Design a protein around this ligand. Structure first.
Ligand SMILES: Nc1ncnc2c1ncn2[C@@H]1O[C@H](COP(=O)(O)OP(=O)(O)O)[C@@H](O)[C@H]1O
Ligand SMILES: Nc1ncnc2c1ncn2[C@@H]1O[C@H](COP(=O)(O)OP(=O)(O)O)[C@@H](O)[C@H]1O
Ligand SMILES: Nc1ncnc2c1ncn2[C@@H]1O[C@H](COP(=O)(O)OP(=O)(O)O)[C@@H](O)[C@H]1O
Ligand SMILES: Nc1ncnc2c1ncn2[C@@H]1O[C@H](COP(=O)(O)OP(=O)(O)O)[C@@H](O)[C@H]1O
Ligand code: ICS
Ligand code: CLF
Ligand code: SF4
Ligand code: SF4
Ligand code: FES
Ligand code: FES
Ligand SMILES: [Mg+2]
Ligand SMILES: [Mg+2]
Ligand SMILES: [Mg+2]
Ligand SMILES: [Mg+2]
Lengths: 391, 274, 121, 283, 121, 280, 272, 98
């Protein structure tokens, strides 16, 4: 309650700022009205951060290397530039994978060019080619190389695209250049966009002229689930129990071949709209594959999403969906019976960069908790369009 | 809610005629606003009395950008009824010089300065060349009525011809029409009937003929309009007469451009040019 | 990256190869190749380098950032519709008209048209 | 061998008349001169060709379809022994008014008219505003020496200050400099001294003072220059005097523009503007 | 040969690789790639396949033959100016507007624009 | 199952009134159908939505940036039991092709996916005066499977019917477009029922229900509703239903045999519409 | 030489009114040329006494191309010394239906068939759609004067409004003006004042009113224009009054469009 | 010309593909690539190869540009493809332009 109290609180909080900072930050704070359909008149997003105000946002390199490309396990990702960027992002995100690290999986490893002064002055293209050669002898079982560029790469004018083309043609290898310099974009969102563009332009269209893959009318691809602590595996077991076949996983526990097999798949299930809506739209426009957003946070959202997904297939899938819901009902009923009385009525404030504040609200409400505050570091206005109804 | 524009060659008293016109309309229960589209920001000094009104272009650059600009900082009512805005312009050689008008006109619509209490809106626009942001009123249909301030001298009649040519080009796209001619007099012979001859051939009408006076020279030092200085002045009543015909003007025509010889032949017969 | 420059001042359209993402902008590529886009400032506010850019490979359109300075100049020149502003803010997709001194080359094929006049006609 | 020249000033002060007469005077000394009309009015070659008006580049380009097919011979007209071209302009309301200047100078360079078969090349550029097209000759290093026609008028000096601001803006990337200042008689008593002071404030020189002579009108009706109409007249002598000191000019300086207040105080000094006070403002 | 197709009906400009000089015309290249240029005749006498061609590599412009049949059709839809007719007759250079069913692909980069309407508006 | 239909004819003969009344009957039998107005004046959805001239795609795409930014719900409205209605509209007179709106609207409907599976019929009302341009696009691009030509006893409406059949046979090889029949709208002229029957036999097709004139149609139009809803118990309401049953039960989709202009003249004198013509 | 164009919806008497118009005009000794810009080629049958004049488009295709075409084979003189040109369209579905007008008008200028001291040139143009070669006379400033033939019906008045919108678009680029509203009667009550109401809404004066009778149809079997059939008839003089009012019309006014409801209110308030 | 014919000069010699029916039906570009290798073997002192295409080359559909690019870079020698099919143009005049 207390909408006027919230407005007065916003006003008295904004008083410390200088005129420019106050005027800009006023646009980014709002009191939720669930009846609004267009967020942009009510609130503004996807703008540059005010200097010297201790923002929580990251860079495009974090959004590309750390979020999208990093979870892919059989590829080797090179942090092109100085050592800090690769060092601080090493194994800091829990994307679960099955493999032997250093032989056929390389997720928790840090491959970098380790730029020095002479690299900055003369360039690192020859160093990049030498590094690509060194990687192949050291790790013969890698199935592809990506070059995630840091700030000096674009700042000194290196040509990583031509190096990637030449080396890939020479070694018959997939080499993907990603121009994800941190100064590009205001947050990790442009990193998501750049990584999706790189996937579309260097990876996705490779098994286009082949048809050796045996497809099935029940083929789905999980898009935008990064297996944080094993989330994608739970979602996968829930989907496979429903009678579908999951061909691809983007990109938690993901493989390059699974990415290449995504054009064959009949339907795309997109868990995160913010990071992978671009490639979903591209696939819908190119291969004619429809896509939909689902939510597996909490029993209510999980059941709703399962029924919505089953509605896109024949009646056997719906019967299997009802079977799965009936099988799993007592477990979450017992969980609620145990934990809701302890958590009933508590108030929670949230602040996560995109999709997840809105995504977990249902799970909290399934335990009698209510979300007083929801917040995003990098979400666009469509995400706020989606979250105004849920708050 | 009629919006007009004053177009003419520089140096033909257009800024003063617009200001004394505006002062003449303020007294008769009308709330009007002046928008200075001339690059040099001397088009609101007699109303505001200010030495030099800060232009929108000036204060947008110092405040970072035009988004950080407040309407109460650009729109000053030095006279209670009259609202004055100076668009400003860039430095010479730096981009299009008319782009100051585009920023100011867009800014005023964005903040809604055209709301619920304006009877007249006047644009004092550079008329030497009609391009970029100077042709923007006619091109964007911002100013439905256009009055040209001309003179006996050939360049002023040539300037009036060019504006009429630009009105014809945008006649179909927009309601904008030539409302009449304003003849500002230098102490030369056979002027009023010369511009009447111009108007009769353009298909438009003369509105008034303001003669040169020395009362305006006294007003310049005051930084005030003649009307507020000496309301009993013969020029001050002349400006009321020009103002009253502006409100009660009803015919708005699509102009007829005049060729080089035909404009020239008008000058030779009157003896202005040999 | 392949860039095709086109202008009525140019007898023939010029085809150049450019390195993507350089700190030097489209203005760099143009100046190195003798393309006479009018550059009249060093702070990116005059808008005289306005060019019309066409992505010839529509599948290979790269997401970019439209900075607040370029956006405001495009409004002051008038070459920024409200739909293109919303498209850039929500989808991070470039508008049709750009400032060459503030445009970063991407890895695609581009057609760059200019009239030899400063932005704002 | 070529001295590229430009003449700037406010509309209607006598740029074309003075330029044509000075160019006609130059031909008397055996100088080959070319006149490029960079004014949308397109009457800066009338008194040399004795014609109604020279056909502009924009006219032939539109009537023929494009600028590629345009013959140099049709574009370049030789009268009095001096070549004449008119840039023209687009229709008022569309495009940039200075677009004709951009098209004309580009076409002339491609076709070879600008090659050094001429001692002097002159540009009659409108200076009521400094934008694309009209400031293009300064920006693209196409006119090394600029002469500003200025009268004892508030607007005329304001335009002169604006043109000097354009010159200094491009003073570090090219050799465009300010040759001098031409004063044309506005029948103003203190004006010859007024422009002398303006040139000293700007750091340049008054190259000459042209007196208002009614013999110019008698040559203008004839579509002829004053020097050929009446070679023994003293007006032809002043134009001849202006021609010699233009050739003998060596003071090409980067000007120092002055502010709006310094322009106004300079007007009040010579009595054109009265002495203003702050206590006589409200009445 | 690289051909870029462009139309308001197409959401994105399409880039294709084509073999130059084939007896199957640009109409052939468009139909294999699913570009919906209206083709409403088999004798080359309608104007339905009118397209606008821009040679992106202005230096690599190939001399061709403007067939009398195509010339007359282009004049029947008011798309052949007299200056361009003279340029084709004397210099053997292609006009701006062409008929796709009668246009032979050359070894260069082309931008092909069509509106989805037959020639003659 | 996705039975796509088109109605052609001369301007001003009653295509929109016949189409909306036909469509109203189809919904009464529980058929989910959609109307796409391909006429430039865009009044073929007045009597289904009851509001006004429906906002066209040309207007919505112009006020917005472009076509893809425009919303499906903004142009495709639901009326009379949810029969979907869209208007193509047209460009400004004298600018471009008058049928450009048809080319734009059909592409937008396909790209969005408005041709959903649970639709039974889709009707296009298109001016038939000229065949060319965007008005031939539904025939050329296989958009409409079966065509019904509204025709009257007038010489022009008969000539326009022959022109449309000429278009079908030209594109018959490349697609499934066929002639469904002819609808005779009555001007109350004498000996017109057999005249349209004779023309259909000359063309080689059947003739769909003949519609007598009445002033009850204008009565429902002034209130902006279909005749069948305004009076369900009127004979015109059942007559519109009878035309709709024959449309659903129609199975004779033939490739027409266009006839020569002199044949049209000869067949007009044999019914008294045209006076017999002697060269001398 | 005055160039005029007759625009209107298909089937309101656009052809016969034009044929009888210039039949009266040549009775005054004037030299008038008729150009048929309708894909239907009956726009000149009643002044030539022919089954169907060979269209320029048919002749070009048969004889190779339009270059091989001769002026004599396309220009035929009729009664009163009227010069007759017919330009057909293409077959349905084959390109723009208006290419015939562009080919014919360009052909006539190239052969110089206009300069031969002609007084009046009349274009009978399809008015169902304003586009392609049908809008070409307005687009290229071919016909300075334009008369719309309309009746008291929605489609006829809607067509008149559409042509007026076309005049406004090209008014700035050439002297193409709306001259008047020729009104023909389908024998409906209060039609004279209804069309006059539409005309004064435009601000352009109506030229004349043409009632319906059977005299034109008796002439139609003859293939001979009413004026030349029987000069003493009621309608025979009525086209004389319409021709006289056309040659002596000194006022041309740019039209202002009328909205759909505004036109609907005009039709409703007349009891229809 | 001043040269040794067959060694470093080849003006009066006729090098041809000698198309047969199978080359008309099945491609024709594989023969072109094989022909270029034999020219290198038997005439090593040549300083470039030009492919002058006759009428059937453009009528059956052949990509002599790609063969010129692939074989030119492989052998580090200039291969010039000329699309001078006789039916193109009305006379020898267009042959000069091509
Ligand atoms: N009605 C008038 N009577 C006498 N002098 C006038 C009149 N109007 C203007 N002036 C004089 O003409 C000069 C031009 O003024 P201004 O409007 O500032 O120039 P511009 O027309 O270029 O804006 C002023 O100095 C003013 O004193
Ligand atoms: N030296 C002079 N003495 C007297 N009158 C002159 C002189 N030079 C020009 N004029 C007059 O000034 C008027 C405008 O001069 P013009 O050269 O057309 O101005 P612009 O600089 O705009 O070309 C002309 O009508 C001319 O008669
Ligand atoms: N069945 C009918 N009975 C009587 N009048 C009708 C009938 N159908 C249409 N009309 C009348 O004919 C006029 C034009 O019909 P409309 O449907 O607008 O033609 P179009 O085919 O051009 O859309 C309308 O005003 C309407 O009142
Ligand atoms: N003044 C008139 N009186 C009676 N009937 C007419 C009159 N004018 C035309 N008609 C009839 O109207 C029809 C109009 O057709 P027509 O004028 O030949 O071609 P268009 O469709 O170009 O108008 C003709 O069949 C004719 O019989
Ligand atoms: S990718 Fe994104 S900040 Fe969608 S950068 Fe970030 S593992 Fe967050 S709200 Mo860390 S757009 Fe994933 C995210 Fe959400 S790293 Fe994780 S929790 S659902
Ligand atoms: S915004 Fe992003 S994370 Fe920052 S540098 Fe730029 S790509 Fe990287 Fe790595 S090395 Fe250290 S931490 Fe930076 S200062 Fe140079
Ligand atoms: S359009 Fe006009 S104001 Fe703008 S740059 Fe060109 S000449 Fe200057
Ligand atoms: S094709 Fe038909 S509808 Fe299109 S412009 Fe031509 S005549 Fe008009
Ligand atoms: S050069 Fe000034 S904005 Fe780009
Ligand atoms: S399809 Fe008819 S000319 Fe090309
Ligand atoms: Mg002023
Ligand atoms: Mg001049
Ligand atoms: Mg209709
Ligand atoms: Mg007819």
């Amino acid at each position: 309650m207390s909408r006027e109290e919230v407005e007065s609180l916003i006003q008295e909080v904004l008083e410390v700022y200088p005129e420019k900072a106050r005027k800009d930050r006023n646009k980014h704070l709002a009191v939720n009205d669930p009846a609004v359909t267009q967020s942009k008149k009510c609130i503004i997003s996807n703008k540059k951060s005010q200097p010297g105000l201790m923002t929580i946002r990251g860079c495009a390199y974090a959004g590309s290397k750390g979020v999208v490309w990093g979870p892919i396990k059989d590829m080797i990702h090179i942090s092109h530039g100085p050592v800090g960027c690769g060092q601080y992002s090493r194994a800091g995100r829990r994307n679960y994978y099955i493999g032997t690290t250093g032989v056929n999986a390389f997720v928790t490893m840090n491959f970098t060019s380790d730029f020095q002064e002479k690299d900055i002055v003369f360039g690192g293209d020859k160093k990049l080619a030498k590094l690509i050669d060194e990687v192949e002898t050291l790790f013969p079982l890698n199935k592809g190389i990506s070059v995630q560029s840091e700030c000096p790469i674009g700042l000194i004018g290196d040509d990583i695209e031509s190096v990637s083309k030449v080396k890939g043609a020479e070694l018959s290898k997939t080499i993907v250049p990603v121009r994800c310099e941190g100064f590009r974009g205001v947050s990790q969102s442009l990193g998501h966009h750049i990584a999706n563009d790189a996937v579309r332009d260097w990876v996705l269209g490779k098994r286009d002229e082949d048809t050796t893959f045996a497809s099935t009318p029940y083929d789905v691809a999980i898009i935008g689930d990064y297996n944080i602590g094993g989330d994608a595996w739970s979602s996968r077991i829930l989907l496979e129990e429903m009678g579908l076949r999951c061909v691809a996983q983007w990109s938690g526990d993901g493989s390059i071949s699974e990415i290449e097999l995504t054009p064959k798949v009949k339907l795309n299930l997109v868990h995160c709209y913010r990071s992978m809506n671009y490639i979903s739209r591209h696939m819908e426009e190119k291969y004619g594959i429809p896509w939909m957003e689902y939510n597996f946070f909490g029993p209510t959202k999980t059941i709703e999403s399962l029924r919505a997904i089953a509605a896109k297939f024949d009646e056997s899938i719906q019967k299997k969906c009802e079977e799965v819901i009936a099988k799993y009902k007592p477990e979450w009923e017992a969980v609620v019976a145990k934990y809701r009385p302890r958590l009933e009525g508590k108030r929670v404030m949230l602040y996560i960069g995109g999709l997840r504040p809105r995504h977990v609200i249902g799970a909290y409400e399934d335990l009698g908790m209510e979300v007083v505050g929801t917040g995003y570091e990098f979400a666009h206005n469509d995400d706020y369009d989606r979250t105004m109804k849920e708050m | 809610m009629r919006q007009c524009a004053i177009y003419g060659k520089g140096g033909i008293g257009k800024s003063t005629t617009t200001q004394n016109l505006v002062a003449a309309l303020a007294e008769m229960g009308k709330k009007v606003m002046i928008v200075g589209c001339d690059p040099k920001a001397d088009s609101t000094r007699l109303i505001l009395h200010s030495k030099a009104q800060n232009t929108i272009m000036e204060m947008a650059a110092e405040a970072g950008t035009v988004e950080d600009l407040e309407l109460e900082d650009v729109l000053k009512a030095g006279y209670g009824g009259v609202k004055c805005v100076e668009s400003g312009g860039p430095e010479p050689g730096v981009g299009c010089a008319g782009r100051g008008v585009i920023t100011a006109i867009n800014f005023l619509e964005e903040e809604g300065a055209y709301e619920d209490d304006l009877d007249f809106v006047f644009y004092d626009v550079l008329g030497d060349v009609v391009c970029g942001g100077f042709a923007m009123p006619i091109r964007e249909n911002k100013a439905q009525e256009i009055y040209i301030v001309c003179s006996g001298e050939m360049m002023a009649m040539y300037a009036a011809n060019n504006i009429s040519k630009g009105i014809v080009k945008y006649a179909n796209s927009g309601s904008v029409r030539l409302g009449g001619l304003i003849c500002n007099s230098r102490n030369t012979d056979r002027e009023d009937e010369l511009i009447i001859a111009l108007a009769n051939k353009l298909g438009t009408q003369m509105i008034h003929f303001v003669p040169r006076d020395n009362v305006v020279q006294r007003a310049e030092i005051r930084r005030m309009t003649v009307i507020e200085y000496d309301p009993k002045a013969k020029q001050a009543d002349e400006y009321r007469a020009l103002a009253r015909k502006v409100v009660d003007n009803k015919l708005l025509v699509i102009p007829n451009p005049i060729t080089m010889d035909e404009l020239e032949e008008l000058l030779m017969e009157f003896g202005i040019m040999e | 990256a392949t860039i095709y420059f086109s202008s009525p001042l140019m007898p023939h359209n010029k085809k150049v190869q450019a390195v993507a993402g350089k700190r030097s902008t489209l203005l760099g590529v143009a100046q190195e190749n003798g393309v006479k886009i009018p550059f009249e400032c060093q702070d990116g506010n005059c808008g005289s380098c306005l060019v019309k850019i066409t992505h010839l490979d529509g599948e290979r359109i790269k997401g970019m950032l439209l900075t607040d300075k370029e956006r405001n100049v495009l409004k002051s020149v008038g070459k920024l519709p409200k739909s293109e502003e919303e498209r850039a803010a929500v989808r991070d997709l470039p508008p049709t008209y750009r400032l060459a001194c503030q445009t970063i080359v991407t890895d695609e094929d581009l057609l760059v048209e200019f009239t030899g006049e400063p932005g704002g006609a």
